[PDB]
Amino acid sequence: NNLLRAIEAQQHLLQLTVWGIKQLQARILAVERYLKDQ
Amino acid sequence: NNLLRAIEAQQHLLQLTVWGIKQLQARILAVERYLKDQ
């Protein structure tokens, strides 16, 4: 049961890392575009 | 036992991805601020 619970919790961690990576990809892309546009 | 060991190792991997995401959030934020300040 502890092992199932750990995987459940680790999926939530992975979902949060995915959210953060997507935020950062969009923000680095906006900066790259800003510098191209300047 | 292999399954417990895999989750232990995968937690260490998740901790390293978290470290890297935090480094990148701080560095993209510093760049955004630098460009705002220019």
């Binding site: 502890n2 092992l3 750990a6 961690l13 949060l16 959210w19 | 989750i7 978290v18």
Partner: peptide, 23 residues
């Protein structure tokens, strides 16, 4: 991240960026 990380430690032994850090 801290909340889930703490839980997993215990189990294995046995949106904003502030909230992201907490979870």
């Amino acid at each position: 991240x801290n909340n889930y990380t703490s839980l997993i430690h215990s189990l294995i032994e046995e949106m904003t960026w502030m909230e992201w850090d907490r979870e």
